[PDB]
Enzyme design. Structure first.
Site, short mmCIF file in Angstrom:
data_model
loop_
_atom_site.label_atom_id
_atom_site.label_comp_id
_atom_site.label_asym_id
_atom_site.label_seq_id
_atom_site.Cartn_x
_atom_site.Cartn_y
_atom_site.Cartn_z
N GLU A 19 0.80 -1.21 0.00
CA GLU A 19 0.00 0.00 0.00
C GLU A 19 0.84 1.27 0.00
O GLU A 19 0.37 2.34 0.39
CB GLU A 19 -0.95 -0.01 1.20
CG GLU A 19 -1.86 -1.24 1.22
CD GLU A 19 -2.76 -1.29 2.44
OE1 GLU A 19 -2.23 -1.37 3.57
OE2 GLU A 19 -3.99 -1.27 2.26
N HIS A 48 -1.44 5.48 7.47
CA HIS A 48 -2.52 4.56 7.17
C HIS A 48 -2.64 3.59 8.34
O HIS A 48 -1.65 3.04 8.80
CB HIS A 48 -2.22 3.78 5.89
CG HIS A 48 -3.20 2.69 5.61
ND1 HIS A 48 -4.56 2.89 5.65
CD2 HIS A 48 -3.02 1.38 5.31
CE1 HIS A 48 -5.18 1.75 5.38
NE2 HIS A 48 -4.26 0.82 5.18
N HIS A 69 -5.91 1.12 10.83
CA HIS A 69 -7.25 0.57 10.92
C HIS A 69 -7.72 0.96 12.32
O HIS A 69 -8.29 0.15 13.04
CB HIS A 69 -7.21 -0.96 10.78
CG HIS A 69 -6.62 -1.43 9.49
ND1 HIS A 69 -6.28 -2.75 9.26
CD2 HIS A 69 -6.30 -0.76 8.35
CE1 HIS A 69 -5.78 -2.87 8.05
NE2 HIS A 69 -5.78 -1.68 7.47
N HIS A 116 -12.15 -0.84 4.79
CA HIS A 116 -10.71 -1.04 4.81
C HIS A 116 -9.97 -0.37 5.96
O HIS A 116 -9.49 -1.04 6.88
CB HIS A 116 -10.12 -0.57 3.48
CG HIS A 116 -8.64 -0.78 3.36
ND1 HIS A 116 -8.08 -2.02 3.15
CD2 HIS A 116 -7.60 0.09 3.45
CE1 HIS A 116 -6.76 -1.91 3.12
NE2 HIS A 116 -6.45 -0.64 3.30
MN LIG Z 1 -4.52 -1.38 5.18
#
Ligand SMILES: [Mn+2]
Ligand SMILES: [Mn+2]
Ligand SMILES: [Mn+2]
Ligand SMILES: [Mn+2]
EC number: 4.1.1.51
Lengths: 237, 237, 237, 237
Positions: free
Chosen positions: D76, D95, D97, D166
């Site tokens: 990513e 980035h 979660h 995501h």
């Molecule tokens: Mn991810």
């Protein structure tokens, strides 16, 4: 004699440490044990911060909730005494404001078993309401034999009882049993609370409550050893 | 004189450590104390990360929120000053964004007592709304005597006040009292929030609020000793 | 031979420590591994507190759930055996009462994937209901080949299966895979639960479930190394 | 030159440790920084467990997401590159979660500011939906320039963007700013979620969002020092 007595004291201290480390007990909470040598007596720590309780802090009380000890005692000691005299089978009593369970002390929704680990609860946890006999101007505390007598009354023959807008009381035949039950009562309440907002709850049947509530055997000690080990890991003695 | 002053400084540092360790205070939050030697003055740490505050970081402020100290001060120091001048009985003021309480800063649902431990709240926690007198284009901060004057106004004679879409302010007659109250306000809000989604809540009556809100006696110190011990256990001094 | 066997034992112990430290496993829970040298056998720790399990506590069982080991075994060992014989592809089986997942064991709402990390679940987690074939008077336990046979049955070819009012069972092709899946199943359930009360949930499509559920490659080891490092940081070996 | 470069590397490692210790980042997550010496380049750790990242693990990438480094990179990484080329003002991209925020990635309810600490969000956090242009059979990942180009597109000129089913992407003008924003975005989402089930939410006005979203000045560093100190307290370097 004094050797055996020290063992009972050590277990109460350990139970206190476990309940604190597992997030069951707060600054306000206490656990007692009926003197295994004399049913007319029980042991309870003097009024102090739970995290500071040692074997030298345990007091001896009669079934009237009185001690020869000159040190200050818990005001809610009557909760323990009144239950011991009404429930000869009970050898340990615990009072806390267990987080997940607390809400059930002030809502209509009954705390009913939803997993096998909660089967010991029975149909549901009884709720003692001080307003029923004393109006709505009391301090909600259990600082008197008569009030605490009603609490034992509401408890009846069950394993747990909630004191409305106050806290929770756990009973059992051993300190280890009460610690085990207090821990799983907290997990059960947490689970039901989550479930109520996820969907429709399918509760344990009376039949499963009867059958599953009997497999709480060798489990008690495994739990005790686990939480005890967790205490060593944290360096909490 | 300087010995006693150091003791007050030490307590503020301890209170800060306790509030941080118990999850009440965040990076942004601060506690002050009225100079016990001079009511026209109060103590508050210079603008720094709470986890780094020491006794050498405490500043002296007048009731106008100004200090001779050359070091940077908290912008919201006016929250403390304005309250001390309006509330002579208050000896300590705490500002935080206490997690469980925070939501009540932006919803219509009032934060009302549900257990005896929350009785000190009174009927409900008042909510200061900056839009009432300043429109909806402000920074929501309390960085001015006039705005902070309205906050004291909304606080009135109560023990707590919420600043809409901002945070919480706790007051009391001692640092230990404010720490105790801040801790239990957080637990009370957590409990009510859980309860609202479990079932219908049966709140404390005005009578119980009056009676129970008076048993917060020797409890204050037990809590302080407990959280202090917990700090030693964690090696947080 | 004995060197390789010790490696499998070490991984089971590590997995146990990881699951405990990450809050997936409780006092009651256990993980097993099919003997990589003999498919007719699998390894599982003797009945002890998870926090005390060492390599010297692992027992050898046949696909009938029996061992020559003289030490006490887990009563739910049949859950593992029955699955290994029905699922040759499975090399590891884990049973827990994972907190966030637990509620789905007693509500109608199905546990469906909501993020790419949950894609391995498939359409939804199947729910084994003991009442379907045994009535509502059982102990909800999985302490028999026949009952555990039905559990494997409900599991079918999926990656997870819930035992109603009891717990969760995770399967996979390696201990590392099961640990990874157990950890993310817990996070996925937590996420969905939060989402259900925030607004309307837009779930992963069958297409995304198929495609995303295949990128769980090098990820497994990264997770294992991360949680392993976290164990060192905590001094949990 | 190499001295200054090492400082940027150290900050990325620190930021990673902070995000992990504060519960923002998981095993899967990564933060990058635009080379302050060359805008056409940015730094990002090789594909490894976050808890194991050191200054010697940072790779150099071009705005095309390619590196001369022979070590494996994050799939990513294109999320970072595509944003840096579209947003010259951005110097750091993160980035994760993030737990509390995650649910907003799959529900209709928009994440809007509810306290002054969330003002940096703007009106609401934009949601990138891969199905809009690629159907519902994708892996939901951001492993390609074109897909990640759409992500930058959805991000527009805002501070945050959610990738449906995501995770979350945070941007800012400095590593310290992104860490600060990521931490408070998590707290803001937690607060709103709690509020939605307590009562009717009164959100920040566009006016307050504009005014309050500008007081995020000296606050950034206080937060950084606080979380950094918390790392020392935990012995996490
Ligand atoms: Mn991810
Ligand atoms: Mn009590
Ligand atoms: Mn503030
Ligand atoms: Mn089980």
């Amino acid at each position: 004699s004094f050797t055996m007595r020290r063992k009972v004291f050590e277990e109460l201290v350990t139970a206190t440490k476990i309940l604190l480390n597992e997030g069951i007990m707060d600054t306000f909470g206490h656990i007692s044990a009926r003197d295994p040598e004399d049913p007319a007596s029980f042991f309870l720590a003097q009024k102090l911060a739970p995290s500071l309780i040692t074997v030298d802090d345990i007091q001896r009380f009669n079934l009237d909730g009185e001690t020869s000890d000159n040190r200050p005692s818990y005001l809610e000691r009557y909760i323990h005494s009144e239950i011991y005299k009404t429930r000869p089978d009970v050898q340990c009593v615990l009072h806390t404001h267990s987080p997940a369970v607390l809400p059930y002390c002030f809502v209509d929704t009954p705390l009913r078993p939803v997993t096998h680990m909660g089967a010991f609860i029975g149909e549901s946890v009884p709720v003692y309401e001080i307003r029923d006999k004393h109006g709505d101007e009391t301090d909600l505390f259990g600082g008197s034999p008569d009030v605490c007598a009603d609490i034992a009354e509401s408890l009846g023959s069950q394993t747990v009882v909630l004191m409305a807008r106050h806290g929770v009381v756990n009973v059992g035949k051993s300190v280890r049993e009460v610690v085990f039950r207090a821990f799983y009562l907290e997990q059960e309440a947490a689970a039901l609370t989550a479930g109520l907002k996820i969907g429709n709850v399918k509760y344990l049947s009376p039949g499963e409550i009867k059958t599953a509530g009997k497999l709480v055997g060798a489990q008690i000690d495994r739990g005790w050893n686990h939480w005890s080990q967790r205490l060593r890991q944290a360096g909490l003695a």
